Amino acid sequence: KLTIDSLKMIKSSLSTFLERQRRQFPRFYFLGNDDLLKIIGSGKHHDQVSKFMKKMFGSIESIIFFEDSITGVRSVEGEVLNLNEKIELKDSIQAQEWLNILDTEIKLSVFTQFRDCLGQLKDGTDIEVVVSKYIFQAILLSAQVMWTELVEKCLQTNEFSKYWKEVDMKIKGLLDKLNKSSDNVKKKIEALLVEYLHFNNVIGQLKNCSTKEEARLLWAKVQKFYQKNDTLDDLNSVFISQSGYLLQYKFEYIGIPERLIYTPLLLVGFATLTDSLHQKYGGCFFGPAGTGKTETVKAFGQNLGRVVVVFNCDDSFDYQVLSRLLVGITQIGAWGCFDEFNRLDEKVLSAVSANIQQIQNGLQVGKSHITLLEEETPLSPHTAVFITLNPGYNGRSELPENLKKSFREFSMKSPQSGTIAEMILQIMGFEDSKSLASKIVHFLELLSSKCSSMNHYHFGLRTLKGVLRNCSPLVSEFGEGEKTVVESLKRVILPSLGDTDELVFKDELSKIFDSNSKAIVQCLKDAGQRSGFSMSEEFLKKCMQFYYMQKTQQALILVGKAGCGKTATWKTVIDAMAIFDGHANVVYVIDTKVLTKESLYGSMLKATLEWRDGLFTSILRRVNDDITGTFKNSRIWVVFDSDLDPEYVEAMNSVLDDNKILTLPNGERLPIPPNFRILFETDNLDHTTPATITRCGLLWFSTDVCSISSKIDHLLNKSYEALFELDKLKDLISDSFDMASLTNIFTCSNDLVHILGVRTFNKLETAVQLAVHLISSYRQWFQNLDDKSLKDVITLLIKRSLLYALAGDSTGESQRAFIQTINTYFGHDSQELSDYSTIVILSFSSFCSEIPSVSLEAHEVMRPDIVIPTIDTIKHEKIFYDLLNSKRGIILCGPPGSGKTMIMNNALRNSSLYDVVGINFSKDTTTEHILSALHRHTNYVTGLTLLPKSDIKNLVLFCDQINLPKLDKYGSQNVVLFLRQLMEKQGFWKTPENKWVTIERIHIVGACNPPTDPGRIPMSERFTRHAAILYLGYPSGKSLSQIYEIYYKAIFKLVPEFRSYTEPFARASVHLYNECKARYSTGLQSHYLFSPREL
Amino acid sequence: LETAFLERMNTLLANADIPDLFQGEEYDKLLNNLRNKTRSLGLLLDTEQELYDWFVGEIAKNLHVVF
Amino acid sequence: KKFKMIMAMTMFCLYKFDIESEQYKEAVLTMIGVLSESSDGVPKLTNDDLRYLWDYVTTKSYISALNWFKNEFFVDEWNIADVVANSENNYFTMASERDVDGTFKLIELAKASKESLKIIPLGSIENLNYAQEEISKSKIEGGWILLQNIQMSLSWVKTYLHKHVEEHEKFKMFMTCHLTGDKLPAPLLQRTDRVVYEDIPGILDTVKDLWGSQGVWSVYCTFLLSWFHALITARTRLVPHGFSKKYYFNDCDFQFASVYLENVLATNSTNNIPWAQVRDHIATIVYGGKIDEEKDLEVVAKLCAHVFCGSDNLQIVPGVRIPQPLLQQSEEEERARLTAILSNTIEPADSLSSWLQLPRESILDYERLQAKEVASSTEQLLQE
């Protein structure tokens, strides 16, 4: 407790020491302060260091210890590298002291591996035996050197056929050896086959060259690997040539990464990168999304024996953050790629130009030190800077010319998908790779050409790679043939299509290509039964599609109309998965736009340069630490149930793609485990860029997954669960919901004019909830009446619920018209619902006889809480109170001065169960104002819960003018989304502390003017579908005169001799009001607004 | 100068108070001051609800804003 | 450029219409009218000077017609070096469009003046503080200062620079802005000498400018590269016909191509120069990297095939021919010969079509619109 305070007060003072600690081992710049403390502390354990090798290096997973001595390292892919000489460890040795030794020892070990592997291969040894001896990197480099030498020898003459046949034999031998090898050897051979196929392509191209000059020109364009024979410095004995220029191999451990197929675009990009690095410039790639830019940069780094460090740029990267990252990468000597470099602010882009130019100049003139950010730091001569950017997308700025002139740009508009597909299929083992790849490419082009022009249809390289990825685990159940490809195509591409596009897809699949899941459908049905849904064909199909998509893709997008079935779909599927597999499920739901970007990810306390985790960062870090071992065997789902703002979402571009790394401004690198999946629940894709649509698998909801009957059944079986009475009541209510009679009512309600238009499919919740609550509230008086009377009362209650749930947002004319249809479609034998039907304590009566004549005092006209009871006032108060008591949100809409506040306050005044918290919404309202209005009314009780200060009365939020708050530049409102979260999820995240707060006894009502009034803003239906809507129009002129005659009588009680004149004064007043409203309209002046408030 | 000024004015007129100004420990300071002033007038108000409802009533009585 | 032509035409008119007679005014005015497509009709020529203008207009050499006024009357031009040299002020403002920068001109000027240049971009508070400290030091110890993208810090510009410029000898201060950015404070602007940076609109002028900034094969290759750069930059201005889009080529491409040529010549001593390798490299990596279309890559490839064919006698443009160097010359002799070849060349009035290998009719519409804008603006100015 207080000891933690004493530790914290000195923890902040340690930062000035941690910064100078990073100056000794520069790779500490990739670690947070909380990890630096653990590394320094572990003087004797030496095991805390082995947990961070991935952050510091990238390709190293853990150290291998043997009795206080370093023996070797283990790559991420499980490969083992043994050091030439073990590093003997002493207790007094600080972490940096032996880390700096290990860094060089790894390089020496890699060089020794390469040297003796090359020596063995030069003696006629075949490639199929050395794969069991050395790491993949050594075999790769030695094979490249020998291929270069032999191709040069063959270039000395015109003979290429012999070497080509030797290469083909080697390829066939490796392909056959692939089957009978372990996992590690399988990875080694699979990575080697890519380079051998590249060798074969180059040799064939040389073989087809007509003359020597053409062959020399072709040879000058590919990468050549040489080796000096004079230098005694081993680490600089290998260089790489392409188009005349030279670069130096670094002999740094890379592991066994996934390797790209050598395509012409890749080689031309290699040439541009070499040409730019020759003069110590930067390298730039630009083009559309998903064309290989980042991955080709990483491959270029791999071929030069070094791991490329990738940062995901963002607007939160201010000048100091970028400059500090530059200081880190310049001291380390690494190759930093700044992906999505456009996403920075224009000002920061202008500001970092001097730093970039300074780095370039220091590299060119061979300076030793560079002064970025007020301190002179050393400059390693191995650094390089790369940027990749997407021109012309949403939420991206433009590089100033003084910065553009510091890079060399290359366009990567269109990759060669045919070669990639063919080579990947050939390696994967398919018998007919060429025809299959050509068919896949042709089919993808046909889809992109013939299908509808939906804004989210992309069939580029990422789609092809996903299709290929789905083929690896399908070969066992379908065979390496056309069937596997077709089924994977259905598995990947179909879930994203519309209605007609599905038919087009089927037709094209039939034309181009020639041609058991019971264990999971049983689990799906069990889950649906537990949650009470109905497993129709559409719902089951969507569930199966979601199940098969998540099997290989770690991030899914669920798009569909409001209330179409997204949340039910993924909740049911994850429950079924938990039943099927036995793995626990941990679910976090985040309403994205409610939180700011700083609360979502984090923010540096610039007064201290101290990092503070955001909500998502905290969740990811807590999962990665895994203190208690809980998250070992669980699936973790993070649901982003909000709009897809580009600026909120593209900060996870590195998270979503193959990098699987969250990059933070302070340099931290939190990995994404395979059991950490991310969901995007949304209703439109208007502002989403193709950069994120291509990264995630997409599931499109073309229509509702449910029928009205099954939805009503689910709602009834849910409302019953919240209660001998039940067995009879369920039968009675389920009988009274006769869908044959109900469907006509539902389709007839569509012709009415609805303010704040909400689909009829979304009002069934209100109807069912209100009906069940009303029926339950009379259960005491059900023991002592016949079947006919019970049926009549239940029918009347249900008719009232239908009337106020389907037509409640329409004028009194429309309501009166709709009552007739409701009466006629239930049959005329049943109890008739009238305009003012009511139940009295039991008999049926009307509101008309219940009007209480009132006589105000003269002085009572000044009290703002005096309401003159009329028929409309009584009816509205009764319905509003009934809706409030049903624990359902309410929105009251009407023109100004109609009286919404009047009825609300009058209904809640005479009650001892509720309190009112008046909150006002203006054009610029934040959630902080809402939380501030609750401070004096609520308590924080602990997880964390928020309760009213009282223990008896519930709390009601009078939220008026909810149309007013403005939309941001991407068409979303913070406050309305917050209210939606409050009603739907009954909770919210406490942003500065990352905790979930549960709302206990707080109801929410709203008040607003029609959206046609000036300055009013449309509302997301995802918000309005949770609230019952009542329209409340102006009283009639007769009603107005009847109301104000009572006021004038009360006033004229002061002047009795003129009491006979009360009626003409009221008539004159209402006539003046009507005439003023008619003449001086808002078409003359904007403020010519009149209402009964003037009366 | 800024829209936040107009938002504060909207809150002040729509309600009879600005909840943003009074919270944290300022709420407790205001509660102490209201206790003292209410005792000085011989009025018996104990619960925080009565105190603040008297606060907002006094504000509603004794504040006129002219634009 | 357009306002340069408008100013030249208007000032020529303002001078001649007073000095010359009335029939001269009628002739020149109807010439401007037929250029502006407002009135049509042959001028009633009797002088000698207007004969060339009439020839330009009849043969639809609109650009030459526009340049006729400047060529006839005004006998001098000023570059940035002249402006900085021949000015009493100490503050300069250089404006440009987007997609073009000219700080390298200032760096060249600083090297030619044996000064010290401090390039300080303005994006953030740290840069602003550094700029304040540097200005304070440099007003005492001398030295040049360049402020880049001053429109990213408009508040600081409006307060600190305003107060400072409002209130040593070897101290000069430059400021680069954008012609399409936010408005700068007019009082601050008036205290500084203003220069607009842009590329040379000619073709031989560009070759001469590039050539005047530099074994014998290095000189020959540099001459060829200068011709290629001028040709391609001139072609970039015809957005529907010369290219399919609007591209921009600058000093960095020239420097990279020059470095590649030097490396090829140095590392391949046979003097059997792989002209095919040079062609492909310059067409794809150096000048073709920016290009994302395929037709425009084909256009660049065709230009490279024409220029870098590597033949003994090359007719670079339909007028002149370049003999490749002998085996018994010196670098100075080669420079002299190539400078002579450049000097003797005369640019025809139809350069945009004859030198870029383009159909004349396509160029005609572009030239016609360009001349129409200037002529109509001059007519508007001259009626008040």
Ligand SMILES: Nc1ncnc2c1ncn2[C@@H]1O[C@H](COP(=O)(O)OP(=O)(O)OP(=O)(O)O)[C@@H](O)[C@H]1O
């Ligand atoms: N030559 C190749 N061989 C195999 N796979 C490739 C090749 N080039 C790209 N890919 C794959 O295609 C996808 C390209 O994604 P990548 O991140 O490289 O694109 P990007 O240009 O960075 O996109 P964005 O602009 O959206 O970031 C990845 O799945 C990558 O592995």
Ligand SMILES: Nc1ncnc2c1ncn2[C@@H]1O[C@H](COP(=O)(O)OP(=O)(O)OP(=O)(O)O)[C@@H](O)[C@H]1O
């Ligand atoms: N298979 C089903 N059987 C019965 N009712 C269903 C079924 N699927 C959905 N529903 C009903 O549909 C309602 C709509 O809520 P749902 O969770 O589907 O919203 P959603 O699709 O996430 O939309 P949004 O979150 O945008 O409001 C659920 O409350 C549920 O009652």
Ligand SMILES: Nc1ncnc2c1ncn2[C@@H]1O[C@H](COP(=O)(O)OP(=O)(O)OP(=O)(O)O)[C@@H](O)[C@H]1O
């Ligand atoms: N039956 C009635 N008894 C008393 N007053 C009535 C009655 N009918 C209408 N009024 C008058 O109508 C006015 C209603 O104003 P109120 O603020 O309640 O309207 P509102 O619907 O909340 O409008 P706003 O959008 O401005 O909040 C009051 O001045 C009230 O006196």
Ligand SMILES: [Mg+2]
């Ligand atoms: Mg990328």
Ligand SMILES: [Mg+2]
């Ligand atoms: Mg939902």
